[PDB]
Amino acid sequence: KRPPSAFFLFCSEYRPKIKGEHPGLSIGDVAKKLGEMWNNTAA
DNA sequence: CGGGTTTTTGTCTGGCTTCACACTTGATTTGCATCACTGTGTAAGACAGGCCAGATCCAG
């Protein structure tokens, strides 16, 4: 159901970067980082 | 006016679930306001007025 898109793959691939490089915070900071990274780069 | 005898329950007690709860952003899906119109209103009766007809009256 609900076939994902390029952004969902971006999330599922680049969230573990911040989840393993800085595990001291919850994935709220990881989402915030991934979002400020996507907004600064292209698609 | 209040003594017996079961119901009706929140806990004490601490330790096992299954759901609850921060963030995105780009869609995707619902929810709701807006606009020019609609149908149901739906057959007879009362009254004045012109018109001849025939009754009402006049005079040789």
Strand B nucleotides within 7 Å of a protein CB: 22-26
CA A32 to CA A29: how far, in whole Å? Answer: 5
Nucleotide B27's nearest residue (CA vs C1') is: A5
Q: Residues A30, A34, A15, A19: is their CA dihedral positive or negative? A: negative
Overall resolution, Å: 3.2
Q: How far is the CA of A16 from the C1' of B11 (A)?
A: 46
Q: Residues A26, A27, A31, A33: is their CA dihedral positive or negative? A: positive
Q: Vertex A34, ends A8 and A20: CA angle to 5°?
A: 100
Q: How far is the CA of A21 from the C1' of B25 (A)?
A: 24
Among A10, A17, A5, CA closest to A42: A10
Which experimental technique did the depositors report for determining this structure?
cryo-EM
